[PDB]
Amino acid sequence: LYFQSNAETIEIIKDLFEHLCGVRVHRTYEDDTGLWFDTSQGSKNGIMDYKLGFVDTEVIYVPLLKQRTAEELQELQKKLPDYLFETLSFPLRSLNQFYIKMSKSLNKKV
Amino acid sequence: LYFQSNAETIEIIKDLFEHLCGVRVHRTYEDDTGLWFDTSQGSKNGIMDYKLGFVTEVIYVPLLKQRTAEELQELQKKLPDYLFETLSFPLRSLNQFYIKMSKSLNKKV
Amino acid sequence: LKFKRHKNPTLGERLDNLQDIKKAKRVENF
Amino acid sequence: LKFKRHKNPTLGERLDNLQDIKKAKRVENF
Protein backbone atom coordinates (compact mmCIF):
# COMPACT_ATOMS: atom_id res chain seq x y z
CA LEU A 1 0.00 0.00 0.00
CA TYR A 2 0.97 3.65 0.40
CA PHE A 3 4.61 4.10 1.39
CA GLN A 4 6.14 7.23 2.96
CA SER A 5 9.90 7.69 2.95
CA ASN A 6 11.52 9.10 6.07
CA ALA A 7 12.16 12.26 4.03
CA GLU A 8 8.53 12.49 2.85
CA THR A 9 7.32 12.18 6.44
CA ILE A 10 9.36 15.20 7.54
CA GLU A 11 7.73 17.30 4.83
CA ILE A 12 4.29 16.09 5.90
CA ILE A 13 4.94 16.74 9.59
CA LYS A 14 6.24 20.21 8.70
CA ASP A 15 3.26 20.97 6.45
CA LEU A 16 0.91 19.99 9.27
CA PHE A 17 2.44 22.25 11.91
CA GLU A 18 2.42 25.27 9.61
CA HIS A 19 -1.37 25.03 9.17
CA LEU A 20 -1.91 23.79 12.72
CA CYS A 21 0.38 26.09 14.69
CA GLY A 22 1.66 28.84 12.40
CA VAL A 23 5.21 27.51 12.73
CA ARG A 24 7.52 26.44 9.93
CA VAL A 25 10.88 24.80 10.64
CA HIS A 26 13.15 25.19 7.60
CA ARG A 27 16.36 23.56 8.86
CA THR A 28 17.79 21.65 11.79
CA TYR A 29 21.35 20.76 12.67
CA GLU A 30 23.47 19.77 15.64
CA ASP A 31 26.83 21.34 16.40
CA ASP A 32 29.12 21.44 19.45
CA THR A 33 26.90 24.13 21.03
CA GLY A 34 23.54 22.43 20.80
CA LEU A 35 20.54 21.75 18.58
CA TRP A 36 19.40 24.53 16.30
CA PHE A 37 16.15 25.35 14.52
CA ASP A 38 15.71 27.96 11.80
CA THR A 39 12.15 29.09 12.24
CA SER A 40 9.31 31.30 11.06
CA GLN A 41 6.06 31.66 12.98
CA GLY A 42 3.03 33.81 12.29
CA SER A 43 0.28 34.47 9.78
CA LYS A 44 -0.70 37.16 7.31
CA ASN A 45 -0.92 39.66 10.19
CA GLY A 46 2.66 39.23 11.33
CA ILE A 47 5.67 37.01 10.61
CA MET A 48 8.72 36.68 12.84
CA ASP A 49 11.86 34.80 11.88
CA TYR A 50 14.05 33.47 14.66
CA LYS A 51 16.56 30.82 15.70
CA LEU A 52 16.04 28.30 18.47
CA GLY A 53 18.75 26.51 20.38
CA PHE A 54 18.64 23.82 23.05
CA VAL A 55 21.63 23.28 25.35
CA ASP A 56 18.12 20.76 32.67
CA THR A 57 17.99 22.26 29.19
CA GLU A 58 18.29 25.93 28.31
CA VAL A 59 16.63 27.52 25.29
CA ILE A 60 18.39 30.25 23.32
CA TYR A 61 16.15 32.53 21.24
CA VAL A 62 17.62 34.78 18.53
CA PRO A 63 15.43 37.16 16.48
CA LEU A 64 16.27 37.15 12.78
CA LEU A 65 15.40 40.45 11.08
CA LYS A 66 17.36 40.22 7.81
CA GLN A 67 14.36 38.93 5.82
CA ARG A 68 11.88 41.51 7.11
CA THR A 69 11.13 44.63 5.10
CA ALA A 70 11.51 48.09 6.56
CA GLU A 71 7.73 48.38 6.80
CA GLU A 72 7.31 44.99 8.47
CA LEU A 73 9.82 46.05 11.11
CA GLN A 74 7.83 49.21 11.75
CA GLU A 75 4.64 47.21 12.21
CA LEU A 76 6.56 44.56 14.18
CA GLN A 77 8.23 47.18 16.36
CA LYS A 78 4.83 48.49 17.43
CA LYS A 79 3.50 44.91 17.68
CA LEU A 80 6.29 43.08 19.65
CA PRO A 81 7.44 43.56 23.25
CA ASP A 82 10.95 44.84 23.77
CA TYR A 83 12.39 41.58 25.08
CA LEU A 84 11.22 39.77 21.91
CA PHE A 85 13.73 41.78 19.91
CA GLU A 86 16.49 40.75 22.32
CA THR A 87 18.49 37.54 22.37
CA LEU A 88 17.23 35.44 25.24
CA SER A 89 18.01 32.39 27.32
CA PHE A 90 15.20 30.67 29.19
CA PRO A 91 14.40 27.19 30.53
CA LEU A 92 12.74 24.58 28.34
CA ARG A 93 9.47 24.47 30.32
CA SER A 94 8.82 28.12 29.43
CA LEU A 95 8.97 27.41 25.69
CA ASN A 96 5.20 27.14 25.17
CA GLN A 97 4.66 30.37 27.11
CA PHE A 98 7.16 31.84 24.65
CA TYR A 99 5.30 30.43 21.66
CA ILE A 100 2.01 31.88 22.91
CA LYS A 101 3.52 35.31 23.66
CA MET A 102 4.92 35.39 20.13
CA SER A 103 1.64 34.47 18.42
CA LYS A 104 -0.44 36.90 20.48
CA SER A 105 2.11 39.66 19.91
CA LEU A 106 2.05 39.14 16.15
CA ASN A 107 -1.75 39.08 15.99
CA LYS A 108 -2.24 42.29 17.98
CA LYS A 109 -3.92 45.03 15.97
CA VAL A 110 -1.89 48.22 15.58
CA LEU B 1 30.69 15.76 11.99
CA TYR B 2 27.03 15.84 13.15
CA PHE B 3 25.08 13.67 10.72
CA GLN B 4 21.32 13.46 11.35
CA SER B 5 19.41 10.66 9.65
CA ASN B 6 16.00 11.24 8.12
CA ALA B 7 14.52 9.11 10.91
CA GLU B 8 16.38 10.98 13.68
CA THR B 9 15.12 14.28 12.29
CA ILE B 10 11.45 13.23 12.55
CA GLU B 11 12.02 12.60 16.24
CA ILE B 12 13.79 15.93 16.73
CA ILE B 13 10.99 17.82 14.96
CA LYS B 14 8.39 15.89 16.94
CA ASP B 15 10.16 16.69 20.21
CA LEU B 16 10.27 20.37 19.32
CA PHE B 17 6.58 20.77 18.63
CA GLU B 18 5.50 19.06 21.84
CA HIS B 19 7.40 21.59 23.96
CA LEU B 20 6.72 24.46 21.55
CA CYS B 21 3.01 23.95 20.81
CA GLY B 22 1.60 21.25 23.11
CA VAL B 23 1.06 18.88 20.17
CA ARG B 24 2.49 15.40 19.63
CA VAL B 25 2.03 13.43 16.40
CA HIS B 26 2.49 9.72 17.13
CA ARG B 27 1.74 8.23 13.71
CA THR B 28 1.13 9.27 10.10
CA TYR B 29 -0.08 7.32 7.11
CA GLU B 30 -1.88 7.74 3.81
CA ASP B 31 -4.77 5.56 2.67
CA ASP B 32 -7.33 6.03 -0.11
CA THR B 33 -9.39 8.43 2.04
CA GLY B 34 -6.63 10.94 2.73
CA LEU B 35 -3.79 11.71 5.13
CA TRP B 36 -4.14 10.83 8.79
CA PHE B 37 -2.47 11.96 12.01
CA ASP B 38 -2.78 10.32 15.42
CA THR B 39 -2.51 13.20 17.84
CA SER B 40 -2.45 14.22 21.49
CA GLN B 41 -2.51 17.94 22.33
CA GLY B 42 -2.37 19.61 25.70
CA SER B 43 -0.45 19.96 28.94
CA LYS B 44 -0.82 18.82 32.53
CA ASN B 45 -4.12 20.74 32.75
CA GLY B 46 -5.86 18.91 29.94
CA ILE B 47 -4.98 16.30 27.32
CA MET B 48 -7.14 15.52 24.28
CA ASP B 49 -6.47 12.62 21.93
CA TYR B 50 -7.81 13.03 18.41
CA LYS B 51 -7.40 12.04 14.77
CA LEU B 52 -6.81 14.50 11.95
CA GLY B 53 -7.58 13.82 8.32
CA PHE B 54 -6.92 15.87 5.20
CA VAL B 55 -8.97 15.20 2.03
CA THR B 56 -9.01 20.92 1.33
CA GLU B 57 -11.39 19.28 3.77
CA VAL B 58 -10.19 18.56 7.30
CA ILE B 59 -11.71 15.79 9.39
CA TYR B 60 -11.44 15.89 13.18
CA VAL B 61 -12.27 12.77 15.22
CA PRO B 62 -12.02 12.92 19.04
CA LEU B 63 -10.46 9.84 20.63
CA LEU B 64 -11.78 9.18 24.15
CA LYS B 65 -10.66 5.58 24.73
CA GLN B 66 -7.45 6.58 26.53
CA ARG B 67 -9.01 9.18 28.83
CA THR B 68 -9.94 8.11 32.34
CA ALA B 69 -13.48 8.47 33.59
CA GLU B 70 -12.32 11.39 35.73
CA GLU B 71 -10.44 13.03 32.87
CA LEU B 72 -13.64 12.85 30.81
CA GLN B 73 -15.53 14.53 33.63
CA GLU B 74 -12.94 17.30 33.70
CA LEU B 75 -12.99 17.38 29.89
CA GLN B 76 -16.79 17.42 29.66
CA LYS B 77 -16.87 20.59 31.74
CA LYS B 78 -13.87 21.95 29.83
CA LEU B 79 -14.67 21.26 26.19
CA PRO B 80 -17.50 22.76 24.11
CA ASP B 81 -20.06 20.40 22.68
CA TYR B 82 -18.77 20.50 19.10
CA LEU B 83 -15.30 19.36 20.26
CA PHE B 84 -16.78 16.02 21.31
CA GLU B 85 -18.36 15.63 17.86
CA THR B 86 -16.80 14.40 14.62
CA LEU B 87 -16.20 17.44 12.45
CA SER B 88 -15.33 18.50 8.93
CA PHE B 89 -14.01 21.99 8.20
CA PRO B 90 -11.85 23.85 5.67
CA LEU B 91 -8.08 23.78 6.01
CA ARG B 92 -7.75 27.54 6.53
CA SER B 93 -9.64 27.13 9.80
CA LEU B 94 -7.27 24.48 11.22
CA ASN B 95 -5.28 26.95 13.36
CA GLN B 96 -8.45 28.47 14.82
CA PHE B 97 -9.14 24.84 15.68
CA TYR B 98 -5.78 24.48 17.40
CA ILE B 99 -6.42 27.64 19.41
CA LYS B 100 -9.91 26.60 20.55
CA MET B 101 -8.54 23.28 21.78
CA SER B 102 -5.63 24.89 23.68
CA LYS B 103 -7.89 27.49 25.28
CA SER B 104 -10.57 24.91 26.07
CA LEU B 105 -8.07 22.55 27.70
CA ASN B 106 -6.57 25.35 29.82
CA LYS B 107 -9.88 26.70 31.16
CA LYS B 108 -10.21 26.14 34.90
CA VAL B 109 -13.10 24.02 36.17
CA LEU C 1 -6.89 17.35 38.32
CA LYS C 2 -3.71 17.00 36.30
CA PHE C 3 -3.76 14.73 33.25
CA LYS C 4 -0.97 12.18 32.88
CA ARG C 5 1.16 12.19 29.73
CA HIS C 6 0.87 8.95 27.76
CA LYS C 7 3.95 7.22 26.35
CA ASN C 8 4.61 7.15 22.60
CA PRO C 9 -2.45 0.87 8.83
CA THR C 10 -4.91 -1.92 9.68
CA LEU C 11 -8.02 -2.69 7.71
CA GLY C 12 -10.08 -1.69 10.73
CA GLU C 13 -8.39 1.70 10.78
CA ARG C 14 -9.07 2.26 7.08
CA LEU C 15 -12.72 1.32 7.57
CA ASP C 16 -13.13 3.44 10.69
CA ASN C 17 -11.84 6.38 8.63
CA LEU C 18 -14.54 5.89 5.99
CA GLN C 19 -17.28 5.93 8.63
CA ASP C 20 -15.75 9.01 10.28
CA ILE C 21 -15.95 10.89 6.98
CA LYS C 22 -19.66 10.00 6.70
CA LYS C 23 -20.40 10.90 10.33
CA ALA C 24 -18.63 14.25 10.24
CA LYS C 25 -20.66 17.45 10.76
CA ARG C 26 -19.50 20.20 8.43
CA VAL C 27 -18.55 23.43 10.20
CA GLU C 28 -16.76 26.38 8.61
CA ASN C 29 -15.68 28.63 11.52
CA PHE C 30 -14.83 28.28 15.18
CA LEU D 1 0.10 45.76 6.08
CA LYS D 2 0.08 42.00 5.52
CA PHE D 3 3.36 40.11 5.86
CA LYS D 4 4.18 37.94 2.86
CA ARG D 5 5.06 34.29 3.39
CA HIS D 6 8.63 33.51 2.37
CA LYS D 7 9.55 30.46 0.29
CA ASN D 8 11.19 27.47 1.99
CA PRO D 9 26.11 24.12 8.96
CA THR D 10 28.62 26.83 7.96
CA LEU D 11 31.59 27.80 10.04
CA GLY D 12 30.10 31.27 10.35
CA GLU D 13 26.84 29.73 11.54
CA ARG D 14 28.56 27.71 14.24
CA LEU D 15 30.51 30.82 15.28
CA ASP D 16 27.47 33.08 15.31
CA ASN D 17 25.82 30.53 17.59
CA LEU D 18 28.61 30.90 20.14
CA GLN D 19 28.22 34.67 20.11
CA ASP D 20 24.45 34.32 20.52
CA ILE D 21 24.89 32.17 23.63
CA LYS D 22 27.18 34.83 25.13
CA LYS D 23 25.01 37.86 24.37
CA ALA D 24 21.79 36.17 25.51
CA LYS D 25 19.94 37.61 28.53
CA ARG D 26 18.63 34.87 30.81
CA VAL D 27 14.91 35.17 31.60
CA GLU D 28 12.78 32.65 33.48
CA ASN D 29 9.11 33.52 32.78
CA PHE D 30 7.09 35.33 30.17
Author numbering:
A (entry chain A): 62 to 116, 127 to 181
B (entry chain G): 62 to 116, 128 to 181
C (entry chain H), D (entry chain B): 72 to 79, 86 to 107
Task: Cite, word for word, the article reporting this structure.
In S. cerevisiae meiosis I, sister kinetochores are fused through the action of the kinetochore-binding monopolin complex, and together bind a single microtubule. The conserved core of the monopolin complex comprises two nucleolar proteins, Csm1 and Lrs4. These proteins form a distinctive V-shaped complex, with two Csm1 homodimers bridged at their coiled-coil N-termini by a pair of Lrs4 subunits, thereby positioning two pairs of Csm1 globular-domain “heads” ~ 10 nm apart at the apices of the V. Each Csm1 globular domain has a conserved hydrophobic cavity implicated in binding the kinetochore protein Dsn1, leading to the proposal that monopolin could bridge Dsn1 molecules from sister kinetochores to physically fuse the kinetochores. A ~ 40-residue region within the disordered N-terminus of the core kinetochore protein, Dsn1, has been identified as the kinetochore receptor for the monopolin subunit Csm1.
The Cg Dsn1 Box 1-2-3 region shows high homology with the equivalent region of Sc Dsn1 (56% identity and 82% similarity between Sc Dsn1 residues 72–110 and Cg Dsn1 residues 32–67), and we were also able to reconstitute a complex of Cg Csm169–181 (56% identical to Sc Csm1 in this region) with Sc Dsn171–110. We crystallised and determined the structure of this chimeric complex to 2.5 Å resolution. In the crystal structures of both Cg Csm169–181:Dsn114–72 and the chimeric Cg Csm169–181:Sc Dsn171–110 complex, the Dsn1 Box 2–3 region wraps around the Csm1 globular domain, with Box 2 forming an α-helix that packs against the “side” of the Csm1 dimer, and Box 3 binding the Csm1 hydrophobic cavity. Box 2 is highly conserved in yeast with point centromeres, with an alternating pattern of hydrophobic (Sc Dsn1 L88/L92/L95) and polar (Sc Dsn1 E90/N94/D97) residues. In both structures, this region forms an α-helix oriented with the hydrophobic residues facing outward into solution, and the polar residues packed tightly against Csm1. This binding mode is unexpected, as hydrophobic residues are most often buried in protein-protein interfaces, rather than solvent-exposed. The core of the interaction comprises two conserved hydrophobic residues (Sc Dsn1 V104 and F107) inserted into the conserved hydrophobic cavity on Csm1. These residues are bracketed by positively charged amino acids (Sc Dsn1 K102 and R103) on the N-terminal side, and highly conserved serine residues (Sc Dsn1 S109 and S110) on the C-terminal side. Dsn1 Box 3 contains two serine residues (Sc Dsn1 S109 and S110) that are highly conserved throughout budding yeast. These serine residues are disordered in both crystal structures but are positioned close to conserved lysine residues in Csm1 (Cg Csm1 K172, K175, and K179).
